[PDB]
Every structure is written in structure tokens, then in C-alpha cells.
Amino acid sequence: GSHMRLSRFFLPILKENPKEAEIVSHRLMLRAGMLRQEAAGIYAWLPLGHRVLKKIEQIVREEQNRAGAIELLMPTLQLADLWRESGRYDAYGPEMLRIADRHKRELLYGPTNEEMITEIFRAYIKSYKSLPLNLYHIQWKFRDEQRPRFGVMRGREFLMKDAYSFDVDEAGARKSYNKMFVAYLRTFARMGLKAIPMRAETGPIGGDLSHEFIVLAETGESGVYIDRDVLNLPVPDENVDYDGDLTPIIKQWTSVYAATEDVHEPARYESEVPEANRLNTRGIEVGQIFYFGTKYSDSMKANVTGPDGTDAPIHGGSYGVGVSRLLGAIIEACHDDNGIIWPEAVAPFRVTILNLKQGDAATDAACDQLYRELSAKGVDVLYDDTDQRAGAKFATADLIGIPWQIHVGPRGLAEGKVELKRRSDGARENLALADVVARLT
Amino acid sequence: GSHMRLSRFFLPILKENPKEAEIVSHRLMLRAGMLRQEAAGIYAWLPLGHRVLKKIEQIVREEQNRAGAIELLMPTLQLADLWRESGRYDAYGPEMLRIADRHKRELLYGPTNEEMITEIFRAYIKSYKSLPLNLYHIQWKFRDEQRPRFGVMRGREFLMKDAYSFDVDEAGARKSYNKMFVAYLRTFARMGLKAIPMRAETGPIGGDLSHEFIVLAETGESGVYIDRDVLNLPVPDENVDYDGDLTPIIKQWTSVYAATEDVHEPARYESEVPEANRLNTRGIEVGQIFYFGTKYSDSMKANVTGPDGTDAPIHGGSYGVGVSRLLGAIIEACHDDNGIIWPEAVAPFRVTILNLKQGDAATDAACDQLYRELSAKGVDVLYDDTDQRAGAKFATADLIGIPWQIHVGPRGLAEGKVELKRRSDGARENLALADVVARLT
Ligand SMILES: Nc1ncnc2c1ncn2[C@@H]1O[C@H](COP(=O)(O)OP(=O)(O)OP(=O)(O)O)[C@@H](O)[C@H]1O
Ligand SMILES: Nc1ncnc2c1ncn2[C@@H]1O[C@H](COP(=O)(O)OP(=O)(O)OP(=O)(O)O)[C@@H](O)[C@H]1O
Ligand SMILES: [Mg+2]
Ligand SMILES: [Mg+2]
Ligand SMILES: [Mg+2]
Ligand SMILES: [Mg+2]
Numbered sequence: 001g002s003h004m005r006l007s008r009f010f011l012p013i014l015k016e017n018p019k020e021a022e023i024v025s026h027r028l029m030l031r032a033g034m035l036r037q038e039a040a041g042i043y044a045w046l047p048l049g050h051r052v053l054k055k056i057e058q059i060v061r062e063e064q065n066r067a068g069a070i071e072l073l074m075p076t077l078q079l080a081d082l083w084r085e086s087g088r089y090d091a092y093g094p095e096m097l098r099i100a101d102r103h104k105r106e107l108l109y110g111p112t113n114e115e116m117i118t119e120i121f122r123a124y125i126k127s128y129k130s131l132p133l134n135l136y137h138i139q140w141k142f143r144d145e146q147r148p149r150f151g152v153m154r155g156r157e158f159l160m161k162d163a164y165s166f167d168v169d170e171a172g173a174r175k176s177y178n179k180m181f182v183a184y185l186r187t188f189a190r191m192g193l194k195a196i197p198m199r200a201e202t203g204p205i206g207g208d209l210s211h212e213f214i215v216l217a218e219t220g221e222s223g224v225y226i227d228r229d230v231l232n233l234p235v236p237d238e239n240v241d242y243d244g245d246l247t248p249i250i251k252q253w254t255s256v257y258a259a260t261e262d263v264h265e266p267a268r269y270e271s272e273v274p275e276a277n278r279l280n281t282r283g284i285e286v287g288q289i290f291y292f293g294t295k296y297s298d299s300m301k302a303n304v305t306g307p308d309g310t311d312a313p314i315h316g317g318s319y320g321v322g323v324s325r326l327l328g329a330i331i332e333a334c335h336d337d338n339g340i341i342w343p344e345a346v347a348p349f350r351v352t353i354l355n356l357k358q359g360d361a362a363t364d365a366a367c368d369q370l371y372r373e374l375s376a377k378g379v380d381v382l383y384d385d386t387d388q389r390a391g392a393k394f395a396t397a398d399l400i401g402i403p404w405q406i407h408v409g410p411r412g413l414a415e416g417k418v419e420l421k422r423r424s425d426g427a428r429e430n431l432a433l434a435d436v437v438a439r440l441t
Numbered sequence: 442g443s444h445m446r447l448s449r450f451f452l453p454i455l456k457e458n459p460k461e462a463e464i465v466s467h468r469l470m471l472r473a474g475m476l477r478q479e480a481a482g483i484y485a486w487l488p489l490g491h492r493v494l495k496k497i498e499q500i501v502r503e504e505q506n507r508a509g510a511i512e513l514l515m516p517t518l519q520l521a522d523l524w525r526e527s528g529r530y531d532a533y534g535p536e537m538l539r540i541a542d543r544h545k546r547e548l549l550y551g552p553t554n555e556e557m558i559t560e561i562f563r564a565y566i567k568s569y570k571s572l573p574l575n576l577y578h579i580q581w582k583f584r585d586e587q588r589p590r591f592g593v594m595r596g597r598e599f600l601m602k603d604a605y606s607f608d609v610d611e612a613g614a615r616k617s618y619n620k621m622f623v624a625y626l627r628t629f630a631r632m633g634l635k636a637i638p639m640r641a642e643t644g645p646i647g648g649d650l651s652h653e654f655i656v657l658a659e660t661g662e663s664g665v666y667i668d669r670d671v672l673n674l675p676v677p678d679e680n681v682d683y684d685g686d687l688t689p690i691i692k693q694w695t696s697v698y699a700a701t702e703d704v705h706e707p708a709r710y711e712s713e714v715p716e717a718n719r720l721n722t723r724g725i726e727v728g729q730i731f732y733f734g735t736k737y738s739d740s741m742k743a744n745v746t747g748p749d750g751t752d753a754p755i756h757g758g759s760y761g762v763g764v765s766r767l768l769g770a771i772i773e774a775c776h777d778d779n780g781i782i783w784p785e786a787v788a789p790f791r792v793t794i795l796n797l798k799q800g801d802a803a804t805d806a807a808c809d810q811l812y813r814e815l816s817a818k819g820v821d822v823l824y825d826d827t828d829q830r831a832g833a834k835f836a837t838a839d840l841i842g843i844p845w846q847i848h849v850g851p852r853g854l855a856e857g858k859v860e861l862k863r864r865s866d867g868a869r870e871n872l873a874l875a876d877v878v879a880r881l882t
């Protein structure tokens with residue numbers, strides 16, 4: 001149970017709305033002391049920013065591990081020669097940040113890792129009985145985005161969990177796809193989000209193994225066309241069996257129309273969605289699952305021996321979650337006039353203690369008591385022990401979006417009561433200060 | 442309890458001592474399926490290697506936090522404008538990896554973060570009442586080492602925990618320095634190491650505020666002179682009070698002679714250290730604590746308003762732990778002829794189950810029983826369920842360094858017994874199946 005006293009913390013709250021911020025999420029992240037811009041599209045994560053980033057990572061890691069994925073780490077710097085093997089060194093484009101070392105060797109900050117994971121695989125895996133296999137990392141990306149914008153939403157240095165699956169053939173690769181589908185539905189649900197999987201841009205051989213997970217939002221870049229029925233589908237629980245038939249689940253999700261603007265078909269839209277359920281809106285892309293087949297295993301020669309002594313290129317898929325983008329996305333969906341409203345699973349703290357008369361021996365002594373008690377019980381607690389006046393303590397607390405507040409002061413406390421305020425709806429309640437620890441654990 | 446079955450893992454064991462490896466720790470990291478080179482000094486962390494790196498990381502973090510330091514995350518790329526402020530852009534030398542983006546703007550992959558952290562601080566901290574403040578992060582660094590060597594021990598892309606303290610004056614900085622001294626003693630102790638605080642090279646302006654923490658090894662790059670009594674000093678428990686006087690803790694560690702080749706004075710060593718106690722050997726620097734006073738605050742005009750009423754530049758110190766170097770150091774100190782011997786705090790798994798007849802209906806059943814039950818009770822458990830023969834399962838288990846092994850074969854289970862083997866000393870015990878969990882739990 002992680003714990004902090006605000007006076008022992010670094011949380012530089014901003015009084016005014018920063019003029020460089022064009023949207024809510026960006027604006028609130030700067031003002032809640034979560035983020036500092038160091039270059040265009042390149043940010044430092046200040047303490048509170050960091051805590052939520054780490055909460056999000058964990059959830060992503062857990063749902064990857066539940067689905068069978070195995071975690072590694074690839075370096076951020078990759079050699080160009082590896083990318084020359086695939087064709088992509090020159091076909092990728094200006095988004096690639098190329099680097100020369102002291103010896104003039106050609107490097108590049110990885111924008112993605114298809115070549116490097118196929119290179120690691122082909123070194124060690126030679127048989128079909130190793131497969132399916134899915135390896136992932138959570139690692140910093142660099143895309144030299146032409147016009148960085150919207151804070152974490154479109155940065156240059158960003159965090160992606162990217163996972164890549166290896167299979168004998170398409171049929172199997174499809175099984176690997178379906179695992180990730182379900183893992184992603186659960187990943188986003190756990191963050192308080194309805195990230196709807198939409199049919200997305202496929203490659204040249206087309207087919208149907210490309211989806212984008214899109215959080216609905218007027219201020220998003222993706223144009224989207226859905227049947228509203230999609231927004232009410234049930235999400236698999238933690239006990240979903242990842243070795244079984246996942247088809248009946250996927251079919252639930254893929255049976256209602258949901259296409260991005262890239263693959264939308266207006267004829268097919270009408271003749272499938274009732275005008276009643278048609279929503280043409282937009283959203284924020286928080287992940288993407290994509291089957292690529294033998295695109296890298298062909299040119300880089302990643303083969304295995306099949307179940308008939310025969311050598312063939314493996315079939316691949318890639319799966320990406322925008323981990324840092326997600327802080328932006330979550331704030332868009334979870335805010336009000338007074339600031340952030342974190343889902344509990346991602347909040348940097350679960351509870352903040354507001355001393356409403358700092359120094360005063362009765363309130364200080366009660367706030368110390370409540371602090372170490374909740375602290376010792378496993379609860380993530382922030383104790384606002386600063387010199388600030390009450391109204392400032394309230395405003396800061398509402399702003400940084402901590403799920404629950406405990407209001408402690410001379411009025412209620414020198415009478416044996418504290419106040420518990422839920423951030424989500426503003427629900428107030430009075431409790432004896434002995435009973436409140438129990439309420440939260 | 443982060444549990445895994447070896448049939449569903451990625452652990453590419455290597456039969457033959459790789460030719461590229463010059464020292465034990467690099468050889469075993471490769472053999473044990475922990476590491477894979479992608480360029481000189483740049484490595485992918487394979488699943489078992491990554492798990493160790495994360496354990497080390499968490500220990501480092503927990504100990505920084507206990508001492509009161511506050512975690513953020515600075516980006517890997519920094520502006521050259523930033524380093525021109527300090528003068529260090531052109532002074533740092535050819536280890537700095539310079540990068541030009543698409544708009545011709547000048548960046549670098551940061552080799553250290555003193556300018557960046559002084560820039561964050563100066564944007565926000567204006568008064569001495571915000572001090573002392575320690576901000577730190579665990580981030581990937583690049584240093585274009587002249588000769589990358591010794592695997593992870595001298596990489597180019599490497600992980601460091603770097604902390605940076607801010608204080609009003611020199612007196613206050615020494616206090617910040619002492620907390621990190623104590624935190625480093627605790628950090629390295631928890632890793633099963635004797636990293637010794639040696640007096641190290643000081644800045645141009647002299648003094649007694651530089652210490653390298655060095656784990657002795659015949660083979661290391663650092664030349665060290667010690668009083669052997671230093672190896673037996675006590676390491677403060679976790680209830681050490683950081684807000685109080687740490688001097689008597691520091692004075693116990695500084696009173697025995699210990700110095701690196703660069704500050705060693707033979708005359709003073711002859712005088713202070715009894716002939717029998719004298720020891721001149723090598724070791725691996727795993728950490729450094731360092732005071733730089735006003736070095737960055739001066740050039741970058743990062744002042745606070747003091748208690749006397751007036752403006753003055755802050756005093757700083759930097760404290761670095763080689764997180765990734767630490768896997769090489771631990772293996773050097775903790776191995777035998779059979780492979781790695783992980784201290785259990787940094788070990789990738791706590792117990793490995795070895796099934797000695799794979800497919801035997803009876804022993805499969807007992808292994809699963811054991812696997813699932815050790816999961817549920819908290820234990821990092823590997824179940825080697827592979828189609829290997831016993832002699833191979835012992836060899837891999839020994840090699841990868843897992844602290845405990847449970848040997849399970851048809852013989853012992855007919856008597857309702859199993860073996861528990863300790864990797865470190867080869868201790869073994871024969872006991873009831875129904876009893877093995879309780880010892881481990
Ligand atoms: N510049 C960026 N900043 C932050 N997150 C990003 C960025 N680029 C991609 N992401 C995240 O990475 C995920 C997977 O990466 P992918 O390469 O599929 O993105 P993309 O299709 O190039 O994104 P976009 O179309 O937004 O530029 C995306 O779904 C998104 O959540
Ligand atoms: N090239 C490297 N590879 C791995 N770890 C390193 C490397 N350089 C530094 N470190 C780690 O970071 C810590 C602090 O960094 P610092 O800049 O003080 O190292 P340094 O003086 O450059 O040491 P070295 O003499 O090893 O180059 C070091 O104690 C070491 O453990
Ligand atoms: Mg893009
Ligand atoms: Mg896209
Ligand atoms: Mg995409
Ligand atoms: Mg060096």
C-alpha cells in the first residue's frame with residue numbers, strides 16, 4: 001500500500017489553463033502536474049503522471065500474460081541493415097528517426113519491432129511444436145510525427161505495448177489473433193473504457209484480420225461508423241479459457257457493424273444497421289490487432305518444420321496498445337468542469353486526506369492516524385498536509401481526480417466525524433473517524 | 442505468484458560456451474537464454490533476463506522511496522539547446538550520441554540527466570521550503586562507449602537509476618548525500634552483494650563527497666585498496682530513520698580505509714591499515730554518489746529564495762545505480778561450475794518443478810497439483826513440463842540459477858515423497874509430497 005504526504009511530494013499544480021493545450025486531456029495533464037514538455041512531441045512524466053502510467057502498464061502486462069503472451073524487451077536502438085532485410089529501411093518514410101554512431105554505423109530509434117522480433121525468433125525456433133508463440137515488450141517508441149499535437153495523444157516519444165505472435169499457418173495465426181482480441185477487450189474494460197473493436201485497414205491480400213480499438217470521442221482523429229448495439233456487448237471475465245474456442249466470443253463482437261472510415265461501406269451500413277442504431281461519430285484509437293502473414297518470414301527467412309516434415313515460412317500477427325496515449329484517452333472520457341475523474345484501477349492514489357486546519361493538533365493527530373492506518377491496510381493514500389487553505393485543498397483534490405477524499409477539520413472531527421466525498425458524483429457522507437478505514441478496505 | 446510452465450515459455454538454452462563471451466557472467470547470460478545481442482553494446486532482454494532486470498529494478502526503487510526520493514520519468518531524447526546552457530554539449534565528448542530530427546532540429550540520446558532535471562526543477566521550485574528534494578528515475582541511457590565489452594557490464598544502451606537532489610546550501614546537500622549513501626548500502630545488500638563505499642574521484646573543486654560502490658572481483662575494471670574489515674560492517678535495517686542524524690551510520694563505513702586507485706594514498710594506507718588487513722584487488726562499480734554543488738544551478742540560473750530572505754543557486758548531488766550492469770555483477774559473484782546461483786530476491790523464479798518422467802500419468806498429476814498450489818500461495822514457480830530426460834532438466838535448472846528445485850519421479854511418488862534441492866549449496870532433503878509446499882510457503 002503506497003503512500004505519500006503532499007509536502008514530501010512534487011506536484012507542481014498550474015493555476016491557469018495553458019494556452020498551448022487545445023483539448024481537455026492535455027490541458028488537465030499539464031495543470032495537474034502530470035506532464036512537462038521537453039521538445040515537440042517529447043515529454044517528462046512528473047510523479048503523478050508517472051504513477052498512472054505505471055498503473056496502465058501493469059493492467060496491460062497482466063492481460064497479455066493471461067492470454068499466453070511472454071514478455072521480453074527489445075532495445076530502442078535498431079540497426080538499419082535489419083530493416084534493409086525487409087525492404088522497410090527506405091519504404092517506411094520520414095517518421096523514422098535515423099542515427100549515425102561515432103563509427104558511422106547506421107542505427108535508428110525503433111518505431112516498431114516487426115523485423116527485430118522475427119530476427120530473435122529465427123535464431124532459436126525451428127519447429128512447429130514451439131508454436132503458437134507470442135512475444136511482447138512494453139518499450140518506448142519514436143515516430144517523427146510531422147506535426148506533433150494533442151500532448152500524449154500524438155507525441156513523438158511514446159509508450160507502446162507491442163506483441164507479435166508466431167504460428168505455422170493462417171488457421172493457427174487466427175487463433176493467436178482471437179486471443180489478443182479478447183485480451184484487448186478486457187484490457188480496456190479494466191481502464192473504465194468502452195474501446196470498441198472496429199473493422200480496420202487490412203493489407204494488400206485483404207481478408208478480415210485487422211481491427212482497431214477505438215474509444216468514442218468527438219475530439220478524436222478516427223472517423224467511425226457503428227451500430228450502437230456494439231456499446232453494450234459483454235466483456236469476458238478473468239476466467240475466460242484462452243486455449244478453447246474463442247469464436248463464439250469474437251462473433252458476438254464482430255456481428256454488429258463497426259467500421260473505421262478507412263473500410264466503411266455505406267451500402268453495407270444501411271443494409272445491416274437499422275437507422276435506429278446508426279452512429280456516425282469519431283474516436284481515439286487505443287490499440288490495433290493486425291494479421292500480416294508471411295510478410296517478414298518470407299524476406300527474412302523465418303521458417304519452421306511443419307507436422308509433415310516440411311519447411312515453410314511462419315505466419316505472423318502484430319498487436320499494439322498505446323499505453324501513454326491512454327492517459328490522454330482516459331481523461332477525455334473521464335473528466336468534468338472541476339478536473340480529472342480517474343477510474344479506481346488507474347488512479348495514482350485511491351484516497352486523499354484533506355487536513356482542513358493544518359497545524360492544529362486535533363486535526364494533524366487525526367490525519368496522521370488515518371494516514372498510517374489506511375497506508376498499513378494496503379490503500380494508496382495521499383495526505384494533503386500542506387499549508388494550503390481548505391478551498392485550495394478541495395480544488396487541487398477535485399483536479400487531480402483521486403477517487404475518494406477524506407475531509408478532516410475542527411468542526412466534524414472535534415465531534416468524532418470525518419467526511420467521505422466520492423469524486424465521480426460528489427456524494428458526501430459523514431462517518432465516525434474510527435469507522436471510515438473499514439469503509440475503504 | 443508469477444507462474445510459468447516451461448512448455449509455454451521462451452528460454453533458448455545454449456549447449457556451447459559462446460565464443461564472444463570473455464567473462465563468466467556474459468557467457469552464462471547467453472547460455473541461460475537471458476540475453477541476445479542486436480548490435481555492439483545493445484541487447485534484447487529475453488524472458489528470463491527481463492524478469493531478473495525487473496526484480497533488480499523494484500529493489501532499487503523501494504530503497505530510493507524509503508530514503509524519500511520521488512520517482513518521475515525523463516525522456517531518452519533531449520535538446521542540444523539544453524546542454525548548450527550547461528556548456529556540456531561540446532565538453533561531454535564522443536560518448537554523446539547526437540541526432541538530427543526531420544525538421545533538422547538537434548537532439549541527443551541522453552547519457553545522464555542533470556541539465557534536464559535542473560530544467561524541470563527551475564520551472565517550478567522557487568523557495569527553500571520546497572527543499573530538500575530528491576527526484577530520480579530508472580531510464581535507458583546511451584553512451585557510445587569506445588569499446589563496448591563484457592556484455593551488459595559495459596553496454597552502450599544501458600539502464601540506470603539516476604537520482605538528483607536539491608538543497609539550499611552545502612550543509613543541506615551533505616544530508617541528502619548521506620541518505621543516498623545509506624540507501625545504497627541497503628540496495629546492494631538486498632541483492633546478496635557486498636558493494637563497498639570507496640572514496641572516489643572528486644570534481645575539480647575537491648572535497649569528501651564522492652563515493653563509488655564497488656563489488657570486488659579479480660577481473661574488474663576498478664583498482665581498489667581496502668581494509669578487509671570493511672567487508673564485515675553492518676548494513677542498516679529498513680527501520681532506519683532518514684529524517685534524523687545519519688552521520689554515525691556513515692562514520693562507521695568511512696572510518697575503515699577504502700579507496701579507488703584515483704584517490705588512494707599509500708602513506709595514509711600504511712599508517713591507517715594494519716599490514717594483515719591490507720588488500721589491493723579489482724571490483725565492478727555498481728553505483729556512484731556525488732556532490733556537484735552549484736555546477737548546473739549557476740549556468741542554468743536555478744535559484745531559490747532562502748531563509749535569510751534572499752535568492753541563491755541550489756546545491757545538487759547525483760546518485761546513479763547501474764541497474765543492467767547489476768546482472769553481470771551478481772552473476773560474477775554468484776555462480777559455480779554448474780551455472781548461475783541467483784540470490785532469491787533477484788531470481789527469475791523461486792522454485793522450479795522438475796518432472797522426471799514426462800507423460801507418466803502419475804507424476805504429471807502431482808506436478809500440476811504442486812504447480813497450481815505454489816501459484817496460489819504466492820511463489821514464482823517454473824514447472825519444467827518438457828519432454829526432456831532427467832539429466833537435462835537438472836542441467837538446465839542448475840544453469841538458469843533458480844534458488845530451489847523440486848525433483849518429482851515415479852520412485853518417490855510411489856512412497857508419496859519428493860526431493861527439495863537447494864541450488865546454492867546442493868543441500869537436499871527427501872520429504873512427503875504433502876509437506877514440500879509448507880517449507881516454501
Ligand atoms: N505518435 C503516437 N503517440 C502516441 N501513441 C501512438 C502514436 N502512434 C501510435 N500510437 C499508439 O500505438 C498503437 C499501435 O501503433 P500503430 O503503429 O498501429 O499506430 P498508427 O496506426 O500509426 O497510429 P495513428 O494512425 O494514430 O498515427 C496505436 O493504436 C496508438 O494507440
Ligand atoms: N557502459 C555502461 N554499461 C552498463 N552500465 C553502466 C555503463 N556506464 C555506467 N554504468 C552504470 O551507471 C552508474 C553511474 O554512472 P556513471 O556515469 O557514474 O558511470 P561511469 O563513471 O561512466 O562508470 P564507467 O567507468 O563504468 O564508465 C555506474 O556506476 C554504472 O554502474
Ligand atoms: Mg501513426
Ligand atoms: Mg491507424
Ligand atoms: Mg494502428
Ligand atoms: Mg564511463
Ligand SMILES: [Mg+2]
Binds near residue numbers: 729
Ligand atoms: Mg566511475
Ligand SMILES: [Mg+2]
Binds near residue numbers: 653726728729
Ligand atoms: Mg561513476
